[PDB]
Amino acid sequence: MQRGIVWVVDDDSSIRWVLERALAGAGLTCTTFENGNEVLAALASKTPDVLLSDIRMPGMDGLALLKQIKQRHPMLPVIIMTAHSDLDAAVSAYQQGAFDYLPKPFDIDEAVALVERAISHYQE
């Protein structure tokens, strides 16, 4: 079947576009929102393939809506970039989680695709 649906969360408008642009050549459904909140506001029902989150943001902090993302849709495969101040929202990974840390560098399809397989790999 191939194809996938990655709903990642960036920081502000014009950021979700940039990605989806490099994600168009691949031909995937890389939906990106501005805030981790609004993100689960659209997935309120349940993520499609895998959720993701960057480590950038305005000022200090680093997306405090991470623990939110999970609280909504089940713990389906996800992926949070490295980050320097996210370690807090990440700590909730080893504790019954389904996503590790993504370091650099990584291509757009290299990332998206990679997940596409995970999502349908360990289902035992």
Side-chain angles (χ1 to χ4, degrees):
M1 226 83 224
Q2 256 302 353
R3 260 135 227 101
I5 303 76
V6 154
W7 280 45
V8 183
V9 52
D10 46 59
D11 172 8
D12 34 75
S13 28
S14 320
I15 303 290
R16 49 113 218 190
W17 198 60
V18 164
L19 267 167
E20 201 225 38
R21 256 253 147 191
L23 278 135
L28 275 128
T29 294
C30 190
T31 276
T32 23
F33 265 42
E34 315 169 43
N35 240 351
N37 173 308
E38 280 259 81
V39 179
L40 250 294
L43 292 177
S45 272
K46 246 125 143 109
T47 333
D49 241 344
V50 154
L51 224 65
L52 245 134
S53 78
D54 284 13
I55 84 303
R56 71 224 303 98
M57 257 237 138
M60 306 160 156
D61 308 304
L63 309 116
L65 316 322
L66 223 306
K67 198 126 104 87
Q68 139 143 209
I69 275 119
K70 325 309 154 149
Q71 267 295 288
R72 257 93 184 179
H73 45 56
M75 64 210 87
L76 67 125
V78 251
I79 296 187
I80 308 163
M81 261 142 257
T82 17
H84 185 45
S85 296
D86 228 1
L87 211 151
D88 196 84
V91 168
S92 175
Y94 292 2
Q95 167 68 187
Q96 271 267 83
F99 48 104
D100 63 5
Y101 296 64
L102 190 72
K104 332 89 123 230
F106 66 77
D107 201 55
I108 245 99
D109 194 42
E110 177 80 287
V112 165
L114 169 46
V115 145
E116 195 248 39
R117 311 200 272 200
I119 317 194
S120 243
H121 197 248
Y122 36 89
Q123 224 177 269
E124 302 285 355

